[PDB]
Design goal:
CATH superfamily: Cysteine proteinases
Subunit structure: Monomer.
Number of domains: 1
CATH class: Alpha Beta
GO molecular function: collagen binding; cysteine-type endopeptidase activity; cysteine-type peptidase activity; fibronectin binding; laminin binding; proteoglycan binding; serine-type endopeptidase activity
Order of helices and strands: EHHHEEEHEHEEEEE
CATH architecture: Alpha-Beta Complex
Function: Thiol protease. Key protease responsible for the removal of the invariant chain from MHC class II molecules and MHC class II antigen presentation. The bond-specificity of this proteinase is in part similar to the specificities of cathepsin L.
Oligomer: monomer
Radius of gyration: 16 Å
Number of helices: 5
Distance between the termini: 28 Å
Number of strands: 10
Family: Belongs to the peptidase C1 family.
Catalytic activity: Similar to cathepsin L, but with much less activity on Z-Phe-Arg-|-NHMec, and more activity on the Z-Val-Val-Arg-|-Xaa compound
CATH topology: Cathepsin B, Chain A
Amino acid sequence: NRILPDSVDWREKGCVTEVKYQGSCGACWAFSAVGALEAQLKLKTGKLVSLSAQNLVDCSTEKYGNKGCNGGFMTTAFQYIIDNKGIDSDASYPYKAMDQKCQYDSKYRAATCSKYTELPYGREDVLKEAVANKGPVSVGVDARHPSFFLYRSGVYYEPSCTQNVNHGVLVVGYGDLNGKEYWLVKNSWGHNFGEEGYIRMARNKGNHCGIASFPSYPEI
């Protein structure tokens, strides 16, 4: 294993915004992407600002292989931000859990993206390195299993989990709790979900739930 901190929690560095509630809109990919960029924005500017998931839903659309409330890709959302030369703040372009016309306006720009990086498939130590050294990382997980919705505490391990990911989330940390290594995952089902919106997911257990399958992070 690479030489790295044994645990990381980007919330401690003030790099993680409040947990969002996607509602009945499959915008997790958008929340996942903005969350990663929010951390980078804080690292660069010193200011923590929620970015507009809705801007991605409405504007990072067919050209990017995305389908708004019917799903999308974090990577292509990043490329949209690059191509578009910005993304608006959440306050300026609030989330409505619906597909809308693109209403991007540069006057409400709160961040940019210059590039993004895809981590190699399934490599949890590479993921750990990126979380330690770069910041929160956008990932997909298999969140199809009934146990996921009912998670309350501890470290989530679901034998039925697969590497077929379907749910974009944000890895904001990692560590060990009571002998179980975990990834600290920010979800977008509001603070009622899991631990105030977070789930600790099993780490170094064979790419559990595909968490390390498709990681990416942007840079400002």
